[PDB]
Design an enzyme around this catalytic site. Sequence first.
Site, PDB file in Angstrom:
ATOM      1  N   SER A   1       0.845  -1.188   0.000  1.00  0.00           N
ATOM      2  CA  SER A   1       0.000   0.000   0.000  1.00  0.00           C
ATOM      3  C   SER A   1       0.880   1.237   0.000  1.00  0.00           C
ATOM      4  O   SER A   1       1.792   1.367   0.823  1.00  0.00           O
ATOM      5  CB  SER A   1      -0.927   0.011   1.216  1.00  0.00           C
TER       6      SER A   1
ATOM      7  N   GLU B   1      -4.591   6.217  -2.218  1.00  0.00           N
ATOM      8  CA  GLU B   1      -3.890   4.925  -2.244  1.00  0.00           C
ATOM      9  C   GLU B   1      -3.619   4.338  -3.626  1.00  0.00           C
ATOM     10  O   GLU B   1      -4.527   4.194  -4.445  1.00  0.00           O
ATOM     11  CB  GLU B   1      -4.568   3.861  -1.372  1.00  0.00           C
TER      12      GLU B   1
HETATM   13  N1  LIG Z   1       1.518   2.402   4.950  1.00  0.00           N
HETATM   14  C1  LIG Z   1       1.153   3.272   4.012  1.00  0.00           C
HETATM   15  O1  LIG Z   1       2.034   4.294   3.629  1.00  0.00           O
HETATM   16  C2  LIG Z   1      -0.207   3.147   3.363  1.00  0.00           C
HETATM   17  C3  LIG Z   1      -0.467   3.755   2.133  1.00  0.00           C
HETATM   18  C4  LIG Z   1      -1.745   3.704   1.576  1.00  0.00           C
HETATM   19  C5  LIG Z   1      -2.760   3.038   2.259  1.00  0.00           C
HETATM   20  N2  LIG Z   1      -2.514   2.428   3.467  1.00  0.00           N
HETATM   21  C6  LIG Z   1      -3.627   1.741   4.175  1.00  0.00           C
HETATM   22  O2  LIG Z   1      -3.184   1.257   5.429  1.00  0.00           O
HETATM   23  C7  LIG Z   1      -3.513  -0.106   5.613  1.00  0.00           C
HETATM   24  C8  LIG Z   1      -2.257  -0.953   5.501  1.00  0.00           C
HETATM   25  O3  LIG Z   1      -1.353  -0.527   6.494  1.00  0.00           O
HETATM   26  P1  LIG Z   1       0.183  -0.915   6.347  1.00  0.00           P
HETATM   27  O4  LIG Z   1       0.685  -0.376   5.063  1.00  0.00           O
HETATM   28  O5  LIG Z   1       0.890  -0.564   7.596  1.00  0.00           O
HETATM   29  O6  LIG Z   1      -0.016  -2.508   6.230  1.00  0.00           O
HETATM   30  P2  LIG Z   1       1.155  -3.569   5.998  1.00  0.00           P
HETATM   31  O7  LIG Z   1       0.566  -4.916   5.960  1.00  0.00           O
HETATM   32  O8  LIG Z   1       1.986  -3.291   4.800  1.00  0.00           O
HETATM   33  O9  LIG Z   1       2.065  -3.422   7.310  1.00  0.00           O
HETATM   34  C9  LIG Z   1       1.570  -3.687   8.605  1.00  0.00           C
HETATM   35  C10 LIG Z   1       2.694  -3.418   9.610  1.00  0.00           C
HETATM   36  O10 LIG Z   1       3.814  -4.231   9.308  1.00  0.00           O
HETATM   37  C11 LIG Z   1       4.941  -3.456   8.941  1.00  0.00           C
HETATM   38  N3  LIG Z   1       5.639  -4.105   7.806  1.00  0.00           N
HETATM   39  C12 LIG Z   1       5.534  -3.822   6.469  1.00  0.00           C
HETATM   40  N4  LIG Z   1       6.348  -4.659   5.788  1.00  0.00           N
HETATM   41  C13 LIG Z   1       6.965  -5.472   6.674  1.00  0.00           C
HETATM   42  C14 LIG Z   1       7.884  -6.505   6.525  1.00  0.00           C
HETATM   43  N5  LIG Z   1       8.323  -6.858   5.314  1.00  0.00           N
HETATM   44  N6  LIG Z   1       8.335  -7.175   7.653  1.00  0.00           N
HETATM   45  C15 LIG Z   1       7.877  -6.828   8.912  1.00  0.00           C
HETATM   46  N7  LIG Z   1       6.967  -5.797   9.053  1.00  0.00           N
HETATM   47  C16 LIG Z   1       6.521  -5.137   7.948  1.00  0.00           C
HETATM   48  C17 LIG Z   1       4.391  -2.079   8.618  1.00  0.00           C
HETATM   49  O11 LIG Z   1       5.347  -1.055   8.789  1.00  0.00           O
HETATM   50  C18 LIG Z   1       3.207  -1.985   9.562  1.00  0.00           C
HETATM   51  O12 LIG Z   1       3.628  -1.643  10.862  1.00  0.00           O
HETATM   52  C19 LIG Z   1      -4.504  -0.461   4.528  1.00  0.00           C
HETATM   53  O13 LIG Z   1      -5.779  -0.263   5.084  1.00  0.00           O
HETATM   54  C20 LIG Z   1      -4.234   0.551   3.433  1.00  0.00           C
HETATM   55  O14 LIG Z   1      -5.427   0.894   2.774  1.00  0.00           O
HETATM   56  C21 LIG Z   1      -1.253   2.484   4.018  1.00  0.00           C
END
Ligand SMILES: NC(=O)c1ccc[n+]([C@@H]2O[C@H](COP(=O)([O-])OP(=O)(O)OC[C@H]3O[C@@H](n4cnc5c(N)ncnc54)[C@H](O)[C@@H]3O)[C@@H](O)[C@H]2O)c1
Lengths: 207, 170
Positions: free
Chosen positions: A130, A170
Amino acid sequence: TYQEFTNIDQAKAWGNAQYKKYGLSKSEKEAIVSYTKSASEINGKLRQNKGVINGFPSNLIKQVELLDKSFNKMKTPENIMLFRGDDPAYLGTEFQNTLLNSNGTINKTAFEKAKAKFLNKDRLEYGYISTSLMNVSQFAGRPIITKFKVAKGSKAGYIDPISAFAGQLEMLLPRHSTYHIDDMRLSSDGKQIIITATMMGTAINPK
Amino acid sequence: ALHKVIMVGSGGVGKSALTLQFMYDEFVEDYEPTKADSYRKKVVLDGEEVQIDILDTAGQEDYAAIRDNYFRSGEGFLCVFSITEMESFAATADFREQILRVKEDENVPFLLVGNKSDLEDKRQVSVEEAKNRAEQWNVNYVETSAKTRANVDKVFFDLMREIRARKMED
Ligand SMILES: NC(=O)c1ccc[n+]([C@@H]2O[C@H](COP(=O)([O-])OP(=O)(O)OC[C@H]3O[C@@H](n4cnc5c(N)ncnc54)[C@H](O)[C@@H]3O)[C@@H](O)[C@H]2O)c1
Ligand SMILES: Nc1nc2c(ncn2[C@@H]2O[C@H](COP(=O)(O)OP(=O)(O)O)[C@@H](O)[C@H]2O)c(=O)[nH]1
Ligand SMILES: [Mg+2]
């Protein structure tokens, strides 16, 4: 050169223009809506299994299939910069409660270790990625900011018009994607790590 | 006789390395993660000449219809995790559930395989927890290394014996 949006209204105009052409099915939209509500869970299971999905329950495996295949309809028409916020665990388990100094600045030892671990190396992400068209969403305050350079024609979908969280601008990228980390530096703040990476592509390319 | 074995387990546990050690007596490092292949070889199992059929699954793109098909066709399962990766151990319950859902037979030939036994210095999964899970599941647990050959022939032969016993009834 990669387009980098400097205005929310322009970014929305560009995004809507792409979205209009996707022609997503009802089930594809539903899988995408559900993703925006449940991303960390879906991506968590993908990460736990390093991308293997044959142990996923029916509902989840069907959602993954729909998400995967929807990218056949969603490609960027030009080179674009995408922005992503990450928490410390993104760098590894050893960084989880270790990245930050007591005053909120990035610890320089932690930073140097992260730089040795990731800089000038390919990285594979098992989860969907995302991102946002700009760096002004709620995720822009996370301690790690990634700027992805995404080439013209790459799988990338503007899903804001159907997201459970409209306003995030997004852009979703496919799961099982590799990118190369080109640059890692501290913000002028000293409070964030800014990563610049070149998106290479996904292994998930169904017919 | 042809005994049909399916390799299951999270990405990177050693399914491919195990299969290739068994098949060709070589340790093959970093075999293409998303690549699947089938293998067949004649073996002597307790004095009888039989063929083993191994599907080394990739699994990253094995959607419901694909995985359901091969779980149904499979006669025995090597469920592999890495002793260095707790997440891969946790995942084993998922593969087993999905296998059980399609086979509707708890008596399915099945071995729990803790791979990378040469990496004792990096162990995350205790022998206790794995043995306890194996007993709970009424299956055997065997620790292997595709690098050192440790117990590699054993897991494939033991699974074949289980498939054979299941075929004997009836
Ligand atoms: N994070 C953003 O910049 C972003 C951008 C657009 C939309 N969103 C929205 O946010 C939500 C998703 O959140 P997200 O991006 O934190 O979800 P994600 O599944 O990518 O990550 C969840 C958590 O895990 C961490 N993480 C990411 N990759 C990892 C890895 N390889 N190993 C260990 N930890 C890891 C992240 O930093 C976060 O704390 C969705 O609802 C989406 O619509 C987020
Ligand atoms: N040290 C060690 N490494 C192994 C062992 N088995 C596999 N590997 C390595 O672990 C990684 C994943 O192995 P692979 O067989 O491709 O796992 P698969 O994705 O389940 O098929 C590769 O780098 C292998 O070389 C083992 O028993 N010991
Ligand atoms: Mg493999």
